[PDB]
Amino acid sequence: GMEPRAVADALETGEEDAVTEALRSFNREHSQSFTFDDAQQEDRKRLAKLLVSVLEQGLSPKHRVTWLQTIRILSRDRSCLDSFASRQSLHALACYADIAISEEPPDMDVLLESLKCLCNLVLSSPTAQMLAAEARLVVRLAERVGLYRKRSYPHEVQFFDLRLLFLLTALRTDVRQQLFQELHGVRLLTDALELTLGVANPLVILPAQETERAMEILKVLFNITFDSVKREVDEEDAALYRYLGTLLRHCVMADAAGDRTEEFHGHTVNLLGNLPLKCLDVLLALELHEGSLEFMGVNMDVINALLAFLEKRLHQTHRLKECVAPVLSVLTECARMHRPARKFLKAQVLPPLRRPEVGDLLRNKLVRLMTHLDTDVKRVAAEFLFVLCSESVPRFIKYTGYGNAAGLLAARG
């Protein structure tokens, strides 16, 4: 086909017409991933060195898309990734992605292809991660995310904008902190989540690509809130998180296209686990439609859905039981906040019957978690049933058996 040597040699040939066709021929074959060959390792490296020197000096406006395409393809290789991880190479991409604090009109295809290059370099090059922080790309990247309602940007550039935001905040502590503290990240991404859901008549089904965007938003929101929320929050912050929690309540009650409904709820529940737990009362504020689950004059659709997610997530896991802790701690706080919730979950999880650990029952799988290797999963499992048991040690011992309940009574002191 179009080998990397022949593309390199075509570049050593000075004619711009053969380099244009040889790049397009290379961009057609190697666009998919199974074209990757360990035999063409060095020939891909020497071609990157040729292209990078053009990029950090300026790409001609004509055929600019095909030049970024070959770099986006070569950026999938960890060997050629170094050559582009330079201060001016990443400044060129940031300018073509329009997030470089330069302009102070957009070709949507050059804009998107640059974003995919930055995502590949930031993903695996710690030098690119450092230089992207230093270039403060998060500033105008968060700004474009806030103008998504005014500026009709395509789905692809919206997805890779949010993915780069995800990669920057996951891989750089400083960028994660300035999105939260200086760039109003929670409030900004909360508005982006609502726009992506079409909320404000509940949301029942989310389209395939609106789900893809919303999951990435939930991932960035998880990053900037995982350790930055004090839970001793302002009255203004408590309203912001209660607003965000209301959006997550819609996600809990909704469905996504494809099989993504499982991943979609997991991201939702993960974010709920980061909220100030007094803001979780929003989960119980859902007013009673008729077409509901009712318990003691309170809507229990939300808590039934979380319970369903717990029972499903409990089945799939074998040794990654950590992914069950977020829904457990959300359901535990509801049972503390609410009395009809404490009583509804007690009937569903620990119904009066007549061997606490043996069995395929939900009560049995939970008691098995009280004897576990992870210290957090074993504590959230016991605390859940303990709260459901009205925090009574004798009743707590009856349902869980004393052998399993000894850890909770000893650790609590």
The method of structure determination was X-ray
CA–CA gap between residue 314 and residue 93 (Å, rounded): 44
CA distance 69 to 255: 35
Could you give the CA distance from residue 322 to residue 9 in angstroms, rounded to a whole number? 53
DSSP 8-class letter at 294: B
With both helix axes pointing from N to C terminus, report the angle between 261-272 and 235-252 in degrees, rounded to the nearest 10: 160
**Cα separation, 64 vs 16, whole angstroms:** 13
Which tokens sit at 5? 């040597």
Q: How many whole angstroms separate alpha carbon 75 and alpha carbon 45?
A: 10
Domain count, the chain: 1
Q: What is the DSSP letter of 360?
A: S
Using left for φ > 0, alpha for ψ between -120 and 50, and beta otherwise, residue 356 falls in alpha
Judged by DSSP in three states, 298 sits in: coil
- What are the b/e assignments for 135-167, b being 16+ CB within 10 Å? bebbbbbbebbbebeeeebeebbbbbbbbbbbb
Domain range enclosing 201 = 4-412
How many residues are there in the chain?
413
Residues 6+ apart with CB under 8 A from 219: 166, 267
Q: What is the resolution of this structure in A?
A: 2.2
CB 113 within 8 A of CB 155: no
In angstroms, the CA 100 to CA 93 distance is: 9
The residue to which tokens 């995919």 are assigned = 116
Q: What is the spatial distance between Cα 362 and Cα 263, in angstroms, rounded to a whole number?
A: 22
Kindly list the distances between the CA atom of residue 192 and the CA atoms of 124, 149, 216, in Å, as whole numbers in the listed order: 27, 9, 11
DSSP state of 120: H
Gap between the Cα atoms of 286 and 389, Å rounded: 25
Q: Which two tokens stand for residue 116?
A: 């995919």
CATH code of 383's domain: 1.25.10.10
Could you give the C-alpha distances from 42 to 73, 77, 245, in angstroms and in order? 15, 11, 51
Alpha-carbon distance of 194 to 52, in angstroms, equals 40
The structure tokens 């003691």 sit at 296
Amino acid at 284: L
User: b or e along 12-47 (b: 16 or more beta carbons within 10 Å of the residue's beta carbon)?
Assistant: eeeeeeebeebbebbbeebeeeeeeeeebeebbbeb
Lookup: tokens for 155: 């789905």
8 A C-beta contact, residue 382 and residue 405: yes
Give strand pairing partners of 256. Answer: 206
Q: Which residues pair with 299 in a beta bridge?
A: 294
DSSP type of residue 299: B
Residue 407: C-alpha distances to residues 164, 180, 319, 373, 375 (Å): 43, 37, 20, 12, 10
CA quadruple 16, 17, 19, 23: dihedral sign:
positive
d(Cα 272, Cα 326) in Å, to the nearest integer? 8
Identity of residue 396: F
Structural contact between residues 239 and 184, judged by C-beta atoms closer than 8 angstroms:
no
DSSP 3-state of 71: helix
- Return the half-sphere exposure (C-beta side, CA atoms, 13 A cut-off) of residue 123: 15
202 and 250 in contact (C-beta within 8 Å)?
Answer: yes
**Do 187 and 241 form a contact (C-beta atoms < 8 A)?**
no
In terms of Cα–Cα distance, which of 331, 411, 333 is closest to 378? 411
Closest CA to 252 of 330, 349, 159, 333: 330
